[PDB]
Amino acid sequence: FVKKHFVLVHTAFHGAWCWYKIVALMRSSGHNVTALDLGASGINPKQALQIPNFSDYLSPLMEFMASLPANEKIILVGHALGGLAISKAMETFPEKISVAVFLSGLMPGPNIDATTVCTKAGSAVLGQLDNCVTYENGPTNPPTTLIAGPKFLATNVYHLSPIEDLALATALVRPLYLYLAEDISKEVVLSSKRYGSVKRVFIVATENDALKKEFLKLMIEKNPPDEVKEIEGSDHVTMMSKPQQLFTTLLSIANKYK
Amino acid sequence: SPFVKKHFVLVHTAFHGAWCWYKIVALMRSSGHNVTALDLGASGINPKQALQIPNFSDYLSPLMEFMASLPANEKIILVGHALGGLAISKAMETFPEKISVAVFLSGLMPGPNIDATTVCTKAGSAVLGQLDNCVTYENGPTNPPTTLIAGPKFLATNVYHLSPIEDLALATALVRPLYLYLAEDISKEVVLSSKRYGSVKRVFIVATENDALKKEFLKLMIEKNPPDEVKEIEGSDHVTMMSKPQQLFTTLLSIANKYK
Ligand SMILES: CCCCC[C@H](O)CC(=O)O
Ligand SMILES: [Br-]
């Protein structure tokens, strides 16, 4: 047994709360774990319209990374959209990261920019079922924020999760500011000497969706991780639908990747 | 007793939000009932920050607005947990006609007689200064502490001691500061009468292992402001919707059928 320090990063609309089952499992196993709320997420004080710049959204993780003690290194886990966040962290504090885990996360790199990963990622969310957007820059300009609907969550996100988790999420999801893919690419700049220096592990956790898996496969090709693992039977929120398997997998990764 | 779709409205306590009722919300929607769980001011994902709502009325407004927008002919089963007891008491006074029956789950239940001032002071004594809870002074030492922040240990020990470990983890990621409202403010905001507030059916649900609000204190309130009935849920810690979801749910449907 070696005490590890896990740092968990949620995806769009979510917050630190979505990892509650994982956090409980890590803590009861004696490990340290930090689940951050990104800007305007969970109980972060900012509202969507107050953080129009991507850096504002990533602020919480970046500040936490900067306060990490000297010797300490962590297992940085990014979920879906959260991959962009941990990517920025890897580039900024490479020495502080033992291993980075992209749980179905947007994993941009030199051969596949944030514009490609985000355009496709948002592809399966925008204009889906009961989702809806706002227009702060006039109804004539691109949408300002994206709000996830109850139906969308039930049928596309939590479809393989306990019903109470859908209910939990329905009461907690918050709007996502629609950051410009350009703003994003200027914010997330990766180099081989830093980002590329961090051990990287990708976890495929997609179910009954070829196109989506083809997307994940595409990213893996363009920006080859150190390892690819897989979890089966998961919906979009693995920490909700396959908690024990995810925990087991993260523990394994933390143990072998010193 | 035949199943008849009703509308349950859940009101959380200090530091919490609609999120704490997730297991109950799921059970109710599963059974075919309507349920609405609200975030009071600066609670859960409500936009306001504690310091921005120093007046109790701004804490209670999400509830008051919801009640007012309630289609004139529908009634609801209003459930308030602990501090949430004051919020529902207010709604019962303002919208008695719209409440089929009110349920106080370990809830502060001041009557037309015993003022919240008295109860609020007792409730405070059970949280303020407990374990790792702390206060703030955004207005200087010359003035009263401005907010109250629940500590991880206070939660684990006095509130979630009989709940699944994952629920304590969820709470430590969601609990928010509570503005320290003055009893004078609350007392003027929560004016109850036997004419309005008194006309609504009331049930109190006791949590036998409640280490947050002691049985002694809970007992007295029932003494001073007799409810139409009192039920108990054994093995329940303070967060009954956490430690004993199924029993709380069944008890709620039972109350609903009785005071239809
Ligand atoms: C417009 C950006 C949409 C990002 C969607 C995420 O990648 C997937 C999700 O978590 O729903
Ligand atoms: Br309380």
Distances (CA, A) of A161 to A239, B13, B144, B249: 9, 27, 46, 21
CA-CA distance, B109 to B203, in Å (whole number)? Answer: 10
Give me the residue label for tokens 């990374």.
A65
Nearest 5°: the CA angle A47, B22, B28 is: 130
Q: Which CATH architecture has domain A1-258?
A: 3-Layer(aba) Sandwich (3.40)
Please count the CA atoms within 13 angstroms of the CA of A222 that sit on its side-chain side: 17
Residue of A238, A195, A194 whose CA lies nearest to A216: A238
Structure tokens at B28: 């109710």
Alpha carbon A21 to its chain centroid, in Å, reads 16
Structure tokens at A186: 């200027």
For residues A16 and A37, the answer to whether their CB atoms sit within 8 Å is: yes
Buried b (16+ CB within 10 A) or exposed e, B77-86: bbbbbbbbbb
Which of B17, B29, B165 comes nearest A28 by C-beta? B165
Q: Is B223 exposed, middle or buried (0-12, 13-18, 19+ CB in 10 A)?
A: exposed
Q: Is A3 exposed, middle or buried (0-12, 13-18, 19+ CB in 10 A)?
A: exposed
Residues forming a β-bridge with B78: B9, B102
Structure tokens at B168: 């304590």
Helix axis angle, B165-174 to A20-28, nearest 10°: 120
CA-CA distance, A187 to A52, in Å (whole number)? Answer: 13
According to DSSP, the β-strands at A5-9 and A32-36 are parallel
Give me the residue label for tokens 């009932």.
B33
Q: Cα of A88 to ligand 1 centre, how many Å?
A: 17
Q: Cα of A257 to ligand 1 centre, how many Å?
A: 28
Helix (H, G, I), strand (E, B) or coil at A40: coil
Residues in chain B: 260
A43 with B47: Cβ contact below 8 A? no
Structure tokens at B80: 């308030």
Buried b (16+ CB within 10 A) or exposed e, A103-139: bbbbbbbeebbbebbbebbbeebeebeebebbebeee
| Four-way CATH pick for B1-260: 3.30.500.10, 3.40.50.1820, 3.40.50.970, 1.10.420.10 | 3.40.50.1820
For residues A83 and A75, the answer to whether their CB atoms sit within 8 Å is: no
Q: Cα of B69 to ligand 2 centre, how many Å?
A: 28
Residues of A with CB below 8 A from B30's CB?
163
B169 with A20: Cβ contact below 8 A? yes
Sign of CA dihedral B116, B118, B122, B128: positive
Tell me phi and psi for residue B147, to 5 degrees. Answer: -135, 165
Q: Cα of A152 to ligand 1 centre, how many Å?
A: 12
Torsion, CA A217, CA A223, CA A224, CA A227, rounded to 10: -70
A151, amino acid identity: K
A167 with B22: Cβ contact below 8 A? yes
| Residue B6: partners with Cβ closer than 8 Å, 6 or more residues away | B33, B34, B76, B77, B100, B256, B260
Q: Cα of A248 to ligand 1 centre, how many Å?
A: 25
CA-CA distance, A126 to B124, in Å (whole number)? Answer: 46
Tell me phi and psi for residue B151, to 5 degrees. Answer: -85, 155
Q: Is B234 exposed, middle or buried (0-12, 13-18, 19+ CB in 10 A)?
A: exposed
CA-CA distance, A255 to A57, in Å (whole number)? Answer: 31
B45 with A172: Cβ contact below 8 A? yes
For residues A18 and A157, the answer to whether their CB atoms sit within 8 Å is: no
Distances (CA, A) of A183 to A56, A78, A113, A145: 11, 20, 12, 15
CA-CA distance, A77 to A238, in Å (whole number)? Answer: 12
A168 with B22: Cβ contact below 8 A? yes
Nearest-neighbour CA in chain B from A4: distance (Å): 18
Alpha carbon A146 to its chain centroid, in Å, reads 17
Structure tokens at B209: 């292992």
Residues of A with CB below 8 A from B242's CB?
none
Q: Whose CA is nearest to atom 11 of ligand 1?
A: A12
Which of A19, A23, A171 comes nearest B44 by C-beta? A171
According to DSSP, the β-strands at B7-11 and B34-38 are parallel
Query: What does this entry list as its resolution, in Å?
Result: 2.2
Helix/strand/coil (H/E/C) assignment for every residue in chain B: CCCCCCEEEEECCCCCCHHHHHHHHHHHHHHCCEEEEECCCCCCCCCCCHHHCCCHHHHHHHHHHHHHHCCCCCCEEEEEECCHHHHHHHHHHHCHHHEEEEEEECCCCCCCCCCHHHHHHHHHHHHCCCCCCEECCCCCCCCCCCEEECCHHHHHHHHCCCCCHHHHHHHHHHCCCEECCCHHHHHHHCCCCCCCHHHCCEEEEEECCCCCCCHHHHHHHHHHCCCCEEEEECCCCCCHHHHCHHHHHHHHHHHHHHCC
Domain ranges of chain B: 1-260
Secondary structure element (H or E) that encloses residue A32, with its range: strand A32-36
Structure tokens at B24: 């109950």
Residue of B207, B60, B186 whose CA lies nearest to B120: B186
For residues A177 and A40, the answer to whether their CB atoms sit within 8 Å is: yes
B25 with A172: Cβ contact below 8 A? no
According to DSSP, the β-strands at B99-105 and B34-38 are unpaired
For residues B83 and B123, the answer to whether their CB atoms sit within 8 Å is: yes
Ligand 1 environment, Cβ below 6 A: A 11-12, 80-81, 106, 118, 121-122, 125, 146
Nearest-neighbour CA in chain A from B249: distance (Å): 13
Q: Is B52 exposed, middle or buried (0-12, 13-18, 19+ CB in 10 A)?
A: exposed
Q: Give the number of other Cβ atoms within 10 Å of residue A258's Cβ.
A: 9
Residues forming a β-bridge with A229: A203
CA-CA distance, B115 to A190, in Å (whole number)? Answer: 62
B70, amino acid identity: L
Q: Give the number of other Cβ atoms within 10 Å of residue B69's Cβ.
A: 7
Helix/strand/coil (H/E/C) assignment for every residue in A107-173: CCECCECHHHHHHHHHHCCCCCCCCEEECCCCCCCCCCEEECCHHHHHHHHCCCCCHHHHHHHHCCC
Which of B19, B49, B165 comes nearest A24 by C-beta? B165
Nearest-neighbour CA in chain B from A73: distance (Å): 22
Secondary structure element (H or E) that encloses residue A210, with its range: helix A210-222
Q: Is B75 exposed, middle or buried (0-12, 13-18, 19+ CB in 10 A)?
A: middle
Buried b (16+ CB within 10 A) or exposed e, B115-147: bbbbbbeebeebbeebeebbeeeeeeeeeeebb
Longest dimension (CA), chain B: 60
CA-CA distance, A121 to B2, in Å (whole number)? Answer: 48
Q: Give the number of other Cβ atoms within 10 Å of residue A64's Cβ.
A: 16
Structure tokens at A138: 């006039």
